[PDB]
């Protein structure tokens, strides 16, 4: 009696389902029925299952209700088994349990169906419920943007002229960043070979394509369906979209055009931070020394607090009302461009059997989606900051300020918000509160949300990366302040537009009781300790710490201690796990190139942040030993040791693998 | 050329292939029709050859509902097309048609401006929305083998 071990499971269950349904249809029929049509009822079950996966409404015109009620039961029964196995397998994949490439491929294929079923529901609800952004809040959002742009004296981006001599240069840049997608392999399908054909024609005859692109903008408003598929990163899934080449070539030019003109116009104020002249770790450096150059910033003599808020605009992309977005875009660009950009998001998404019209949000895979996100983000920055303070951060149109400076010391002190930036959706705010202002702001919070129970100290987010003497002390004043700041910020933003959540944001309070403020800006995290406080020594032990001067006197005043984010560590570990899959892995040099590329992707980004993060150095030693064992198994060897290290680390020009080392191995 | 203009010969095989294979096997239909991909064959059915398309003339209650919804959700044609029950191409074109009549008769002569907004000598981006060429008398080796 051979067992249902593992590979037998799914085929066995589908037998037991159909065998059970056979019993019921025999019993449910009246005793005078024609003793047939049992097989016909089963085929309806198989169809109802397929309709459920495809999200099609299954309905048979003349089917009698005792059979229909039975099938509607068992489809739900199979759905409960099917869904829970997707949950179970995903919670294994994330933690790094024993898995194989088959179940990883299958589980991704289930999750993407489950996503689309939720997504079709969501888009349908919008038309039935009506637009969640009220007709009064929308006008408020729109009017805000108008007064802002008028104050800047912004000159609208025109429709690109016929004689606009830069056009050919912008075309070449567009085509080059299209062709970079095809560097991976020579194996192409029909749709990809058509794309390279169209690219080569555009090179061979630019004045053809430029006339065709411009003819698209003026006239085209109904576009073809776009594919969707998911990149699997284990820890989460990332959508990827497939756009038809002729549309893609027009979008790529348009993206290049808009960003060039917006830069020249100075649309975006300097706090919109993925910037052409600044790598992300340089952002963190300018941020830290940005803090320290503020006036009096470390003083606590009267009882001053500093508060640092990190948050995300949680579901920014997914909410954007196209009817509003069209009018907002029309304030920047020529209306023909605005109409094109809007319409291009209203496209049929397609994945195998499943199709629906997208209509409530933007498509991230469009070539110009990065423009829309930052402009819409700019609309919401004005909500959080308010018109008045945002004009002081950006400064006069004749003479705009850079990233973290103001005209005067006097203008710094005029408002609590001293520093602001937005990365994409991630928000960073730095507040300076005087003695009285901190008290009054707590009281309002407690008036809405009184806590005699001392629940406030319980659910407070704190980072375990640092010792007990280093992480935030939960003093009752500081905790009450920290929550109350977040509450005030959250009120500024309409929930129909966007929202902020306490579970994913983080708050840190510098105070007479807490000497350290933590934050986690980009891929790595840090805490600033001023030298007039608990350190009392001008230490220099690690190279993993930044001494940072006060710009006026060139005295050191604080230390910034770097560490890698826990999330960034997990990202790297999953990339190593991904390398250890696949069948091309037997080709030794195809592995070690992926290991090398991964390792320099970590090290050259984080630099001195690595050595202070002793938890991550242990992971590097682990990952290196695993991949070396993979080479060994390719030569059998198994458990017997004393395998020579020379074969791995010898540079490729001498015929070794050229492995990069990050551990204390010895010859 | 792969794709291109649709002829009458391909349309009769396309109808007959949906009988054999259904509306969820497009790579089995496109293996039966050369110089057309499965993505194009799917689009050709759903936008000019599904008989649910109300190819007749626009009535007055259709136009009145069009003009409202065009004001109501600007440029978002695909969100309008299942509501009024027409193809979005037809929906856009007829809206463009209605605007042209009213503005021209009130202000203009027969043309006045741009006699060639038409695009000679270049490919159309979407000929699935266009009527079909007839079948030539001398069918070649490719079509008869097909």
């Amino acid at each position: 009696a051979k067992t249902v071990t593992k590979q037998r499971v799914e085929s066995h269950f589908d037998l037991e389902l159909r065998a059970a349904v056979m019993h019921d249809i025999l019993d449910m029929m009246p005793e005078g029925i024609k003793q047939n049509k049992a097989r016909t009822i089963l085929q309806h079950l198989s169809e109802a299952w397929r309709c459920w996966k495809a999200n099609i409404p299954w309905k048979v015109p003349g089917l009698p209700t005792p059979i229909e009620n039975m099938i509607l039961r068992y489809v739900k029964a199979k759905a409960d088994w099917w869904t829970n196995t997707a949950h179970y397998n995903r919670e294994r994949i994330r933690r790094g349990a024993t898995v194989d490439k088959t179940v990883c491929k299958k589980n991704l294929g289930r999750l993407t169906r489950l996503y689309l079923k939720a997504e079709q529901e969501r888009q349908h609800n919008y038309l039935k419920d009506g637009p969640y952004i009220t007709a009064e809040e929308a006008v408020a959002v729109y009017t805000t943007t108008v007064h802002w742009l008028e104050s800047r004296r912004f000159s609208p981006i025109p429709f690109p002229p016929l004689s606009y001599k830069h056009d050919t240069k912008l075309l070449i840049l567009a085509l080059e960043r299209l062709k970079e997608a095809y560097s991976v392999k020579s194996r192409l399908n029909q749709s990809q070979r058509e794309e390279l054909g169209l690219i080569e024609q555009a090179y061979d005859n630019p004045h053809e394509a430029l006339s065709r692109i411009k003819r698209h903008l003026l006239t085209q408003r109904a576009f073809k369906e776009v594919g969707i598929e998911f990149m699997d990163l284990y820890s989460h899934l990332v959508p990827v979209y497939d756009v038809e080449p002729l549309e893609k070539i027009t979008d790529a030019y348009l993206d290049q055009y808009l960003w060039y003109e917006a830069d020249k116009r100075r649309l975006f104020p300097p706090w919109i931070k993925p910037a052409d002249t600044e790598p992300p770790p340089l952002l963190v450096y300018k941020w830290c020394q940005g803090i320290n150059n503020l006036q009096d910033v470390w003083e606590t003599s009267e009882g001053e607090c500093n508060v640092m808020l990190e948050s995300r605009f949680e579901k920014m992309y997914e909410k954007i009302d196209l009817t509003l977005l069209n009018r907002l875009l029309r304030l920047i660009v020529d209306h023909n461009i605005a109409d094109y950009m809007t319409a291009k998001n209203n496209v049929v998404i397609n994945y195998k059997d499943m199709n629906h019209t997208n209509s409530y949000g933007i498509i991230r895979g469009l070539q110009f989606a990065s423009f829309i996100v930052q402009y819409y983000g700019l609309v919401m920055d004005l909500l959080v900051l308010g018109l008045h303070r945002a004009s002081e951060m950006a400064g006069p149109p004749q003479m705009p300020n850079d990233f973290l400076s103001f005209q005067d010391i006097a203008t710094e002190a005029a408002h609590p918000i001293r520093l602001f930036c937005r990365y994409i959706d991630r928000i960073h705010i730095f507040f300076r509160f005087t003695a009285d202002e901190a008290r009054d702001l707590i009281q309002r919070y407690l008036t809405e949300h009184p806590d005699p129970n001392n629940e406030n100290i319980v659910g407070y987010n704190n980072k375990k990366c640092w010792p007990r003497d280093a992480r935030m002390r939960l003093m009752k004043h500081d905790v009450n302040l920290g929550r109350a700041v977040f509450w005030d910020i959250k009120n500024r933003l309409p929930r129909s537009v966007t929202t902020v959540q306490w579970e994913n944001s983080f708050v840190s309070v510098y105070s007479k009781d807490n000497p350290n403020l933590l934050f986690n800006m980009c891929g790595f995290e840090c805490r600033i300790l001023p030298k007039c406080r608990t350190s009392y020594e001008e230490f220099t032990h690690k190279d993993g710490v930044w001494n940072l001067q006060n710009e006026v006197t060139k005295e050191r005043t604080a230390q910034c201690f770097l560490r890698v984010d826990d999330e960034s560590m997990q990202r790297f570990h999953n990339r190593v796990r991904q390398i250890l899959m696949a069948s091309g892995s037997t080709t030794f040099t195809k592995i070690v190139n992926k290991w090398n590329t991964a390792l320099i992707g970590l090290m050259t980004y984080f630099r001195e942040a690595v050595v202070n993060t002793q938890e991550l150095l242990d992971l590097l030693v682990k990952c290196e030993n695993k991949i070396q064992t993979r080479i060994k198994i390719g030569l059998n060897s198994k458990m017997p040791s004393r395998f020579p290290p020379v074969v791995f680390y010898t540079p490729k020009e001498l015929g070794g693998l050229g492995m990069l080392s990050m551990g204390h191995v010895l010859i | 050329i792969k794709g291109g203009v649709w002829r009458n010969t391909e349309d009769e095989i396309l109808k007959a292939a949906v009988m054999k294979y259904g509306k969820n096997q497009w790579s089995r239909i496109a293996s039966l029709l050369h110089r057309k991909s499965a993505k194009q064959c799917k689009a050709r059915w759903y936008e000019w050859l599904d008989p649910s398309i109300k190819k007749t003339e626009w009535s007055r209650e259709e136009e009145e509902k069009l003009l409202h919804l065009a004001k109501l959700m600007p440029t978002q044609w695909r969100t309008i097309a299942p509501i009024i029950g027409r193809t979005a191409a037809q929906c856009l074109e007829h809206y463009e048609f209605l605007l042209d009549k009213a503005a021209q008769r009130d202000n203009e002569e027969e043309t006045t401006d741009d006699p060639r907004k038409l695009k000679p000598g270049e490919i159309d981006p979407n000929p699935e929305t266009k009527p079909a060429r007839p079948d030539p008398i001398d069918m070649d080796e490719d079509e008869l083998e097909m």
Partner: peptide, 26 residues
């Protein structure tokens, strides 16, 4: 005449779609 409401509605749509942006003088 206003009895042909479709002609009035079409005229209204033309005026609302084509106007150039408020940041330049109308």
């Amino acid at each position: 005449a206003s009895q042909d409401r479709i002609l009035q509605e079409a005229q209204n749509l033309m005026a609302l779609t084509n106007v150039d942006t408020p940041l330049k003088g109308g």
